Enzyme design. Structure first.
Site, PDB file in Angstrom:
ATOM      1  CE  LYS A  98      -3.961  -2.295   0.227  1.00  0.00           C
ATOM      2  NZ  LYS A  98      -4.803  -2.019   1.403  1.00  0.00           N
TER       3      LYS A  98
HETATM    4  C1  LIG Z   1      -3.087  15.978   3.305  1.00  0.00           C
HETATM    5  C2  LIG Z   1      -4.275  16.115   2.593  1.00  0.00           C
HETATM    6  C3  LIG Z   1      -5.699  16.797   3.262  1.00  0.00           C
HETATM    7  C4  LIG Z   1      -4.179  15.873   1.210  1.00  0.00           C
HETATM    8  C5  LIG Z   1      -5.219  16.063   0.176  1.00  0.00           C
HETATM    9  C6  LIG Z   1      -5.102  15.432  -1.171  1.00  0.00           C
HETATM   10  C7  LIG Z   1      -5.228  13.767  -0.974  1.00  0.00           C
HETATM   11  C8  LIG Z   1      -3.696  13.281  -1.000  1.00  0.00           C
HETATM   12  C9  LIG Z   1      -6.211  13.070  -1.096  1.00  0.00           C
HETATM   13  C10 LIG Z   1      -6.309  11.478  -0.849  1.00  0.00           C
HETATM   14  C11 LIG Z   1      -7.628  10.917  -1.086  1.00  0.00           C
HETATM   15  C12 LIG Z   1      -7.553   9.402  -0.765  1.00  0.00           C
HETATM   16  C13 LIG Z   1      -8.587   9.140   0.670  1.00  0.00           C
HETATM   17  C14 LIG Z   1      -7.132   8.507  -1.462  1.00  0.00           C
HETATM   18  C15 LIG Z   1      -6.908   6.996  -1.595  1.00  0.00           C
HETATM   19  C16 LIG Z   1      -5.698   6.306  -0.573  1.00  0.00           C
HETATM   20  N1  LIG Z   1      -5.656   5.001  -0.557  1.00  0.00           N
HETATM   21  C17 LIG Z   1      -5.815   4.546   0.786  1.00  0.00           C
HETATM   22  C18 LIG Z   1      -5.467   4.260  -1.852  1.00  0.00           C
HETATM   23  C19 LIG Z   1      -5.094   2.974  -1.923  1.00  0.00           C
HETATM   24  O1  LIG Z   1      -5.346   1.843  -0.816  1.00  0.00           O
HETATM   25  P1  LIG Z   1      -6.634   1.077  -0.460  1.00  0.00           P
HETATM   26  O2  LIG Z   1      -6.360   0.395   0.838  1.00  0.00           O
HETATM   27  O3  LIG Z   1      -7.235   0.157  -1.506  1.00  0.00           O
HETATM   28  O4  LIG Z   1      -7.652   2.375  -0.154  1.00  0.00           O
HETATM   29  P2  LIG Z   1      -9.338   2.338   0.333  1.00  0.00           P
HETATM   30  O5  LIG Z   1      -9.856   0.976   0.704  1.00  0.00           O
HETATM   31  O6  LIG Z   1      -9.157   3.194   1.770  1.00  0.00           O
HETATM   32  O7  LIG Z   1     -10.057   3.026  -0.743  1.00  0.00           O
END
Ligand SMILES: CC(C)=CCC/C(C)=C/CC/C(C)=C/CCN(C)CCOP(=O)(O)OP(=O)(O)O
Ligand SMILES: [Cl-]
Ligand SMILES: [Zn+2]
EC number: 2.5.1.58
Lengths: 5, 346, 314
Positions: C110
């Site tokens: 991850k």
């Molecule tokens: C610091 C800040 C406020 C940044 C805003 C801009 C960003 C980077 C937003 C990210 C939004 C987000 C929740 C992206 C998904 C991140 N993951 C956890 C991706 C892949 O991992 P998985 O474990 O499959 O995710 P999940 O099952 O939680 O969808």
């Protein structure tokens, strides 16, 4: 957990 | 049960202080952790428990300023932390050249965001350099990368770019036409927005897309009424009790904001079930240490603590400021920003 | 070489090969914010990483140092970039690096940086031969891993490897017909090969989906696919669909079916159909069924939908 970066 | 407000204030306070070596993987994203904590305190109207001046200096020490020769403009913005070992310099002296020192779009975003929340006026921000760095990050397809050296590109960074342009109140930082094209192309057959064309629509990317358009003030212009209705349908279908990020996936506290905020921007959050959402969010509240987790009986973290609170905010929780659903700061802070922009226009 | 947990591990500050380098410390100023506490080992590796990084030293020792930095924190994107700079400068065996990243990703599936690194390597090698199988393995630990699916779509698109994906999709849908990621993949393959304009294909797909729906009626994914491939052609343009669904309502009912019906009726009203006033009532009747007993959690939403149909067709 949640790595968003 | 009930919202343990004071417990959460202490939680965020601790975050701004020290973190366990087990957060080492967030080293390069420390500025976003600071954001979660600062914006979190702001949302609880407790910014008074921190020294705004000290933190503002720290933030400015993360700005990648252009060097004497201004040969690094394409790399300006903010660093996530001081991990490169560059000597502490709160945007005082000019930039000290370094082969690999560049800004990170998510850090420039959270950085500026933090400065505004702390009351700073952004006078020490080299707006033009930041915008120059931003432009450099955009790709032919309209999306963005996080750093000039290269990285993956998707909706997350499109949102960051949008927030940056919005806060600096200058959209020269991006080719808006191309960005909008990227956002449109990300819409799935199921009508949600994905990280990119063809990918699975997701609550996170849907928020980033819709919020970006709202920030550009082109939601109505980009999507037809029929399209917006389909998007609304997809979004509201995300509520199970709390919200999940994708069909058939378990709910996660942070989606109470990602999806909830999108619904708010689409003006239909009012038609969701507040009680079940609130109940779920609270079920992930750590009554002992404070903060929130993605799931109940799970360990809390800055991200879920912040988004859980913003989720509660969307429903005007007693004791929590109204959050600006597109900018991800308190409305109070968004207002202070409006004033800032006006003052500049003189 | 020398593992971080090896009994004979030695701090870089105590290594002869590194005597000529002055470690560069990290400093967060007078009042550190969100500071992470680091162990002796951790700070040691990174103090030397900063040194090497700061001097852009394209050495073999630097390359080995990145391995340690990555073991300490695979999320440090700068470390990966520098490692790529070194891979090129030292003309390292990229096939070896593929094995490395393959192991890393399995331990941290991850992490954004590791998937990005692998994609760059595959671009360099112009060799996608390992990809589909590798991704299938990762998808075995988590069939919904967004990173895995994203990488899989890139590979397939970039090297035009469509030939077996539709079959892979059929297999996974059997393993879990509720996996929304697989339904998306199915639409990805089809729309990028035959397209849906071929009535033969559209019929095959609509038929396929109805079959899956009959097996598990309560599956938003299946319903979303069905509506997805037809909504733009016009749901009302399919008279036999409306009836085939009304026939399911008795047994295989679900809020997804009711919603579909409401959407069909709305398409009809949108196309000045016959019995405008009668259709609208059929819709409203369903909107209320959803609000009052079928999808109660969205009670207010459905009522709002109903009121919208009201003031739009009267
Ligand atoms: C610091 C800040 C406020 C940044 C805003 C801009 C960003 C980077 C937003 C990210 C939004 C987000 C929740 C992206 C998904 C991140 N993951 C956890 C991706 C892949 O991992 P998985 O474990 O499959 O995710 P999940 O099952 O939680 O969808
Ligand atoms: Cl609303
Ligand atoms: Zn989460």
């Amino acid at each position: 957990f949640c790595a968003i970066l | 049960l009930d919202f343990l407000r004071d417990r959460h204030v202490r939680f965020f306070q601790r975050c701004l202080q020290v973190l366990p070596e087990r957060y080492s993987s967030l080293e390069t994203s420390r500025l976003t952790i600071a954001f979660f904590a600062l914006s979190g305190l702001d949302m609880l109207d407790s910014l008074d428990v921190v020294n705004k001046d000290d933190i503002i200096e720290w933030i400015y020490s993360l700005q990648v300023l252009p060097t004497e020769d201004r040969s690094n403009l394409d790399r300006c913005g903010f660093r996530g932390s001081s991990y490169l070992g560059i000597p502490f310099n709160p945007s005082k002296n000019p930039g000290t050249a370094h082969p690999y020192d560049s800004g990170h779009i998510a850090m420039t975003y959270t950085g500026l965001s933090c400065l505004i929340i702390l009351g700073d006026d952004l006078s020490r921000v080299d707006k033009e350099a930041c915008l120059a760095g931003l432009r450099a990050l955009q790709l032919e397809d309209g999306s963005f990368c996080a750093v000039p050296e290269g990285s993956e590109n998707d909706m997350r960074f499109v949102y960051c770019a949008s927030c940056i342009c919005y806060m600096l109140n200058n959209w020269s930082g991006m080719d808006m036409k191309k960005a909008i094209s990227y956002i449109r192309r990300s819409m799935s057959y199921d009508n949600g927005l994905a990280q990119g064309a063809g990918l699975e629509s997701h609550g996170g990317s849907t928020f980033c897309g819709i919020a970006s358009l709202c920030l550009m003030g082109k939601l109505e212009e980009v999507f037809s009424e029929k399209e917006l209705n389909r998007i609304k349908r997809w979004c509201i279908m995300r509520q199970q009790n709390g919200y999940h990020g994708r069909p058939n996936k378990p709910v996660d506290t942070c989606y109470s904001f990602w999806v909830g905020a999108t619904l708010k921007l689409l003006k239909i959050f009012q038609y969701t079930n507040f009680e079940k959402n609130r109940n779920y969010i609270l079920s992930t509240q750590d009554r002992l240490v404070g903060g929130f987790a993605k799931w109940p009986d799970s360990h809390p973290d800055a991200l879920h603590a912040y988004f859980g609170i913003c989720g509660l905010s969307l429903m005007e929780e007693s004791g929590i400021c109204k959050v600006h659903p597109a900018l991800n700061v308190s409305t109070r802070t968004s207002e202070r920003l409006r004033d800032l922009h006006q003052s500049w226009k003189t | 070489f020398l593992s971080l947990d090896s009994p004979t591990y030695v701090l870089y500050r105590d290594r002869a090969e590194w005597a000529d380098i002055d470690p560069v410390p990290q400093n967060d100023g007078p009042s550190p914010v969100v500071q992470i506490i680091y162990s002796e080992k951790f700070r040691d590796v990174y103090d030397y990483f900063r040194a090497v990084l700061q001097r852009d030293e394209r050495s073999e020792r630097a390359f080995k140092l990145t391995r340690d930095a990555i073991e300490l924190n695979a999320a440090n994107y700068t470390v990966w970039h520098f490692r790529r700079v070194l891979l090129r400068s030292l003309q390292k065996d990229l096939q070896e690096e593929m094995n490395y990243i393959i192991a890393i990703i399995e331990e941290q599936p991850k992490n954004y940086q590791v998937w990005h690194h692998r994609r760059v390597l595959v671009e360099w090698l112009k060799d996608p031969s390992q990809e589909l199988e590798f991704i299938a393995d990762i998808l075995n630990q988590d069939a919904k891993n967004y990173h895995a699916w994203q990488h899989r779509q890139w590979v397939i698109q970039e090297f035009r490897l469509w030939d077996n994906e539709l079959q892979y999709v059929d297999q996974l849908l059997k393993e879990d017909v509720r996996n929304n990621s697989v339904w998306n993949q199915r639409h990805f393959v089809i729309s990028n090969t035959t397209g849906y304009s071929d009535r033969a294909v559209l019929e095959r797909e609509v038929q396929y989906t109805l079959e899956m729906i009959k097996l598990v009626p309560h599956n938003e994914s299946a319903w979303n696919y069905l509506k997805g491939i037809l909504q733009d052609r016009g749901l009302s343009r399919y008279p036999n669909l409306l009836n085939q669904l009304l026939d399911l309502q008795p047994s295989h009912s679900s809020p997804y079916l009711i919603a579909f019906l409401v959407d069909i009726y709305e398409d009809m009203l949108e196309n000045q159909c016959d019995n405008k006033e009668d259709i609208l009532n059929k819709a409203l009747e369903l909107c209320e069924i959803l609000a009052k007993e079928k999808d109660t959690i969205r009670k207010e939403y459905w009522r709002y939908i109903g009121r919208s149909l009201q003031s739009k067709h009267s």
